[model samples]
Structure formats: C-alpha cells, structure tokens
Target: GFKQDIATLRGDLRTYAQDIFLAFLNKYPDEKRNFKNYVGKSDQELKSMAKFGDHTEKVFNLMMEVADRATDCVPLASDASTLVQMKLTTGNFEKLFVALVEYMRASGQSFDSQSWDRFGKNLVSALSSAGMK
Candidate 1:
C-alpha cells in the first residue's frame, strides 16, 4: 500500500520532499543546526539552495524506499552504520517518521494507519539491528 501510494505521487515527490523537510525542521527547530549549509537562511531562502534541495530529495527517497519495502526494511549495513555514526537516535527517527506522516496528511494524501504502523515497526527493527539505541 505504501509503495503504491508513492508510485502515484512520483510526479509530485519532489515538492512533497521539500514540504516534508520543512515540516520536520519546523517541528524540531533545534534539528536545523545539523544542516550546516542551511543555517542563517530563512525557510524560503533555504528552499532555493542546491545543497538543501539535494539533501531533502535524498531524505525523501530513502524514506520512500523504506516504506516501499517495509515488510523487509533492512537498510544496507553501510547506510545504517552511517546513520548510527551521525548519532541518530530512535527518538529522532520517530520524530522524522511523524513529520513524514504529518506532511502526507497536510497535503491531503491518502494513507492508512495500519500501513504506517507496519512501516514504523519494520523501520525500528532495521534500525535496531544496525546497533542503533
């Protein structure tokens, strides 16, 4: 269901990506400091930066990929290691997941709670297996 939903939104994924990123930052303003290149810029100005756009798209694509394969959402070992190295805790991951879901709802996208539950569970499993605390 998640994969199908993403398939239907392929054309608008780029815009959704930006919205999700902004939403996440809005929800957790302190998180903004992590984006070195985006600091000191207004939201509107940050939206236009190449680095911001690139990172947002990458984040969106990875989230989509995890949702697409939620049943077996094992990320690559290297990728998981990188996330761990970045000090991403499970709490932070949960916040981002909420941000993604909030974006979908705010944008009037269709999604079922069950699918999100499964996605969240599988994601936690994958992250935990990678040694995330």
Candidate 2:
C-alpha cells in the first residue's frame, strides 16, 4: 500500500536525518565543536539529546519538501523553499559528503550499503530534479 510505504519512507528518512549528522561529526571531529552543546559526545550520546530530536524532525520535514519537488529546490542541500536556509557552498557539503563516505566505510560490516547509496544519490538527484542546468 502506498500509505504503508510512505510511513516506511518517513521512518527511513528520519533515521537518515540523524545518522547524517552523527556521521558528519564522525568524519570531521573538529566540526562537532560547532554544536557547543554536543561537543565531545559519542554518536549514540549526541543522538540521545533532546536537541537531536528537534533537529531531526526539522530536517526531516525540510528534506521531504525539497526531495518531493521536481523543480526549484536548492542545490545546496538545504530546504531553500523554507526560506530559513543557509549556504553550505563554501563548506561544499563538507558534512553531508563526509557522512556518505562514513556509510561507505561502515558498509563493510553492516551491509547497509544499498540504502546509504540511495540516500546519497537522492540528495544529488534532488538538485538536478530541481531544474538546475
């Protein structure tokens, strides 16, 4: 059923939201300091914080919005339609691509390479799907 699958998609997307950030910190340890409240915490520890809950939910909605659009979605990996976005261009998606590579590295043991690949691809697809030339 489409409804059931949408629910599954929602769950998977949410996990991606959380995992990406943690993976970012894992790849670039120094960036963790940007989250003053989360600095020095392990992946599990940071994910456990209440702030993580709010942050994931926010990005989940934003990503869904951006990904669902076939055009006009920003290429910078943010929900540009939301108007409350930032430019990671200078940073060049440093965290996101880093997160994807972590998945590549971890897939050697976890066997989640497929979804990791899909998620990473979808992010880029979102940009081109947005009518970018």
Candidate 3:
C-alpha cells in the first residue's frame, strides 16, 4: 500500500532521531538524568513503587527520539495519498506522534528495523517544528 526510499532513510532516521534527542536535551536540561538513570535500565532490574517509576528518562527519551524520526518517516510508510488521507483525532494523532519520536530517538542506529513495532504522539507541535507535515 505504501513505499519509500527506505535505504536512504535508514541512516537519516538514526541521525535524525539522535539530533532531535540532542535538541530536546538542550531545551530541557533537567531531563539528562532520565536518559541516564531510568529508561535505559536493563529488563532484569525491577522497578519499585517509590520510583516515578517506569517512565525513565532513557525510556522516554528513547521514545522521543524515535518519534521525531518516525514523523520524518511514517508519512513515507504509506503511499502518497490524494484519494484518501488518514485522519486521526488531534489527541490520538498527538499521542501517536510523540510516542513515535520517543521510540525512534531511542533507537540510535537500529530504528528502521523497529518501525513495525513502535508508535508515538503525532505532531510534536502544530504551529512550527523543524519538521512536521
């Protein structure tokens, strides 16, 4: 139903997510710990109720990074549509977008391979972002 020049996108997606991640950190200085202390934790580790908790920085950032790149990529996933446009609720779309970026951002270099599985909020913002359509 859809296709893109994915080979070219592979490297771009990785780099894109990483770049977005850097930018986000630049905007939110306090988030560095989340990237370091939380999301990246090994699956073997157990989260305690006291922790704030599963949504670690690493996990969230990873999601953010992938999502940014996903935004760049998902439109490419489906064929360019003039006949039919996919309409998602503003809330649903936003959630899909944000989650996608986070997931993509986390992937670093392996993002394309994981596209089938991840999703996020749509439109990190509506008015103006470096990339959004």
Candidate 4:
C-alpha cells in the first residue's frame, strides 16, 4: 500500500509538471515565436532566433529534447492524475511534511530551528572541545 501510493504520488507530480508546461509557455506570449522556431526549424535556423543566443539553447533544449525523444510519460490533454491529497488523513500530512522538510535540509537548504540549533551546538561541542564546554 505504501509503495504503491508513493509511486502514485510521484506520477501525480510528473503529471502536474507536464499539465502546467503549456500554461508556463502561455504566460509568456512574447516567447512564442522563439518556441515555435525551436520545435519547427533546423538547428542552424533555430540558432537565428533571438532567444537562442548561447547555451540558452542547451538550457531550453533540455525540455524540447525530452519532448522529441520521450516515449514514456508523454502526458496527454485527456489524461489526468489526481492531485496528491496527503492532508486527507489526520496526522499523516504532518508526518509527510516533516519528512519532506528533512529532505530539503539534506539537499543543503538551511533549516535552522530548535532541533537544528540543538544538533549544531552538540556537534560543535563534540568536534572542538576536549570535554563538555
């Protein structure tokens, strides 16, 4: 149950990313011509589009290349996924949020707070002091 549900959540998040991509493009009308050129034109021609200035192509192509090559997870307009409803269960949401916060901390984001303050103090004391300082 747990593994299946976690897989479902991961799929839901990926679906959300695709579901929102068109909107991300739509929000920037000034960027449409450039996007069109990317999808339609040859690489040399695409290089002519003002937006294709430099490694900008590589950065933008990260998504475009995926679109051109991806065989799996090609989200369709008709295919929809249920949004993760973690808060549907009492205390479950809090447990998930705490674990997610720990993940973010492990990703190198500074999450300084009471537990962190205690941890930092003790770690420094152990690393530096001959005995308890």
- Per TM-score, the best of the predicted structures is 1
Instruction: Write the residue-wise lDDT of candidate 3 on 45-117 in tens digits.
Output: 4134223233333333443444344554343222223112523223333433444445455655454433433
- Order of candidate numbers by TM-score, starting with the best: 1, 2, 3, 4
User: Residues 1-133, candidate 2, lDDT per residue (tens digit)?
Assistant: 2223224446766576677667777777777767799876777887789878678768656555544542322234344323333432324243565575566556544334444345445555544444332
lDDT of 4 by residue, 96-119 (tens): 234433443454434332333233
TM-scores of the models, in the order given: 0.76, 0.56, 0.26, 0.21
Best by lDDT: 1
Error of 1 at 93 (Å): 1.7
**How far in Å is the alpha carbon of 91 misplaced in model 1?**
2.2
The per-residue C-alpha lDDT of model 2 at residue 19 equals 79
**For model 1, how does the per-residue alpha-carbon lDDT over 24-109 read when each residue is reduced to its tens digit?**
88898888887777778787997889878787888778777655644434445555555566626676777776876676666555
Ranking by lDDT: 1, 2, 3, 4
Q: In candidate 3, what residue range of length 10 has the lowest lDDT sum?
A: 75-84
lDDT, residue 64, model 1: 70
Q: Scored by Cα lDDT, where does model 1 land?
A: 0.69
Task: Answer with 2 or 3, whichever has the higher TM-score.
Answer: 2
